[PDB]
Amino acid sequence: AVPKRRTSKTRKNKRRTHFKISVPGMTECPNCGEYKLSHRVCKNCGSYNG
Amino acid sequence: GYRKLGRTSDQRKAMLRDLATSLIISERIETTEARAKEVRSVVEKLITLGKKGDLASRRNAAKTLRNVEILNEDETTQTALQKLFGEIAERYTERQGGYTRILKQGPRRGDGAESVIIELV
Amino acid sequence: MIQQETRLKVADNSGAREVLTIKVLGGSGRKTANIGDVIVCTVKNATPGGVVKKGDVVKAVIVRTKSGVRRNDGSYIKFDENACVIIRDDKGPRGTRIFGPVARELREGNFMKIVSLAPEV
Amino acid sequence: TKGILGRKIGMTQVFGENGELIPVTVVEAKENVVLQKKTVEVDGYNAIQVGFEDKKAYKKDAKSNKYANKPAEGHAKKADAAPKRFIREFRNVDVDAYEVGQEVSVDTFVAGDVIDVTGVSKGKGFQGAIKRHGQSRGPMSHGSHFHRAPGSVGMASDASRVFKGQKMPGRMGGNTVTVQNLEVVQVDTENKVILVKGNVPGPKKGLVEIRTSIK
Amino acid sequence: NHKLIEAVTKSQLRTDLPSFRPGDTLRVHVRIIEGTRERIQVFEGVVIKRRGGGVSETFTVRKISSGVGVERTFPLHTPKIEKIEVKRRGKVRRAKLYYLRSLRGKAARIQEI
RNA sequence: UUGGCACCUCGAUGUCGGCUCAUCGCAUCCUGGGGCUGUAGUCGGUCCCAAGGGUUGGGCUGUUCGCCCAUUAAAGCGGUACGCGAGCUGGGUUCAGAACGUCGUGAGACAGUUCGGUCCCUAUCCGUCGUGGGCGUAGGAAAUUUGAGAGGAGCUGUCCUUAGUACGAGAGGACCGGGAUGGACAUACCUCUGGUGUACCAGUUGUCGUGCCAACGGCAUAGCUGGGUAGCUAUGUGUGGACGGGAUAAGUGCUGAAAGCAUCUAAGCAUGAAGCCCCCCUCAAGAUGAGAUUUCCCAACUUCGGUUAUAAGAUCCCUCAAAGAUGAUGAGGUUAAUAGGUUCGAGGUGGAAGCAUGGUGACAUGUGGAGCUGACGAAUACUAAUCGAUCGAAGACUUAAU
């Protein structure tokens, strides 16, 4: 099956409405001061210490 | 079983035994999140056989552990079975279950897989 | 018996030895028939000592099934082979002897002659 | 007419008086109170509300549904009761029941012997047309290239469309069904269980609704 | 074994039955109401299987009537059974004796302890 | 239906039967209600209402058609590109090979036979089956719920009893009412009877390895063979089409004139179908006409007349299954039994290892229904569900009633 018609810029830009990504969901660690992911270790100097 | 881990029956038993014998010689290894939850039950059942100490327990543990020469003893080529029933079994003589701890690292490069660290508590 | 092309053994004292089912009476689209059901069958192998010859369209009642039957009290009975008895229009058997055991539930007020001629019920 | 709620426990069997087999479903029914009563003046129809299983009180975090939130905590205090999940309404019952909370026991279903059970879910998720609508397959020998697919979906160029209500793959199971004309074997005190002949819809630990038969 | 299951099951279970192991001769006395009057009929055979459970426990007995085999399954705690005795015991090495179905004659016999 | 015409398509609209899945018409094959009869009864023959449901397996033939066998309450006739090949098949006819009869001087042809012979395509749009986000419903939230609408369901047999009664020379044998138990079909479910059960238990063959013997492991379909827990399942186990109202068709009427009688109709008043509208089951307020009930929340700044955050609540992330392609829905996050481990049970397998004793041995018997055991039921914070972050109100104007 082949497309019967060409695709518009309107129809092409409406389909990619939900073709996005979200924020990684990060927090601040009060041992290294830098941002980090949740339920994970500070990738910089530090550790989990849960 | 519990989860197939993307392999077949005979390949899954050869991989679970490879990680269990690695957590005894090094006591800390890096792996994937899905494989860390499976080897968590394989090692914790081998420590229970080490707290028994019977000859029937030494033979029920020879079916899993591979034959490697730990130098953790640092003398006399100690086997992966001789480290068990010894210093490992003495460390958890009072602890009742839960001899494993897993920590999460993050998605790795080129794979997007969750790297973790599993170690003996 | 159970289906359209099943081979049944004739148990009563007549020339018929093996018969081939042709139809299961009772309603339309009727598929199977358990112990106590009348069928239409044909004679495949016949005994010269009997009166029924090879290639005869007759009627018969089912008396033994390998599948079995369930009772109200919760018990089951199952046999080793399949068997049938050639009957008349008024439920009379063509033969004065019955061989082998017989299912315990055929005395429904209509097969009194069959259960009495049976050696063991 | 009467009705209660309960959780499906499992299937067993009992022996009759003369001796037989009766397949039996075990259903526990405890802590059933009246949370509200509705009349014809307000909302224009008579009914009663019932709560089945009490939950914990108000908490600071309350992030797992185990604790009743403020709108539900204040809802179960007007009836002088405890916050109970699984609230349902019974219209067939008579309104001779106090609007204030009062417990309902299993002993009211003695000598009932005619009930019906409402199921909440099945849990299959299976999509295939053979498994969902019970269709026939195609040949498996003979060079066939048609085993478990649905057949034609319409005619050719007369309607030039697919009619509504076709039998196509999709999620199956998990819908409301109601089995009618069951029977009550025995009502057990000190366990608050009811024995029902046959089998009820839903998996284990699922809510069931027992009402008086309408026929 | 849910706790609410045995609570209702404890009213139906029986105890007077003697314990037997698969692979022994069993003489069963069953009551039949077939006909206007009631009477007791005996069933004698070998126990070929016994699947577990609570109230829903069954056992299977197989005999030979005349050349052909007969198999009957009874629930353990049924009221229809009046009495059960153990006539002869046997030596087997498995719980399910499914191989007896195909054998007959001098091969369908079991040694005794 | 066989034709007549040659109006669209030759820079392509794939022909016969069969399979899967349907849908519509009434000129009705079965069932429901009636009139007439050369209708005694039991069975019929005609015509009139009626489309709700039902309308079977085999042999021969590529066959449609047709004949035959055994059943059934009955085995209806047609439309849909003689429905359906981007859903399947390719036995028939119309490819290249070969042969027969026949025809032609011949290369070759059939008013004819026979045996072989490549069926491609990742779904853009409308359509259909499932399932999410956004905004709306003049404050923001959590539960319960009314039903304008829409879909599902709708079938029927054999015996018993009224009664060997009515009817009839005898044979033969009821209407109307009341029970029992099946056939096909539809749905829930796994306690039973079975199937499966690739991280459960047990027997055994060849070869290699753990230094050797004993005891184990790898490889040969899961090496092979006998059993089997949870889950999923039919052929297994329950249930369903029950019982009634209202308006009608074909029919039968009462009263009654136009037409002094008569007459169902013109006024008026009834009775009367498996069909129609309901009663039974499911979805349903995006029903923009956006409904109803119950409970929870309520300030600080401003001269904007309007803003910001927080509240009630809901999510990011994390442990999971009663749910599941993903998401969504459910059970839980340290005031914690959500999942592992540990400790006891249920079910399954059927007598572990070591030692002892008896035989020259292969083996057998004891301590011991031992040992082992995924998915099932309990108890127990021992290991992970840390610490944190985001989103989310402060209620428009007019007229009546106070």
Ligand SMILES: CC(=O)NC[C@H]1CN(c2ccc(-c3ccc(CNCc4c[nH]nn4)cc3)c(F)c2)C(=O)O1
């Ligand atoms: C190949 C293609 O792509 N064609 C595109 C066009 C053409 N076409 C089409 C298709 C089918 C046919 C056709 C149909 C049936 C018969 C009868 N056979 C028996 C016989 C009789 N006498 N002798 N044998 C003959 C031909 C046609 F006549 C036309 C269509 O549908 O569109």
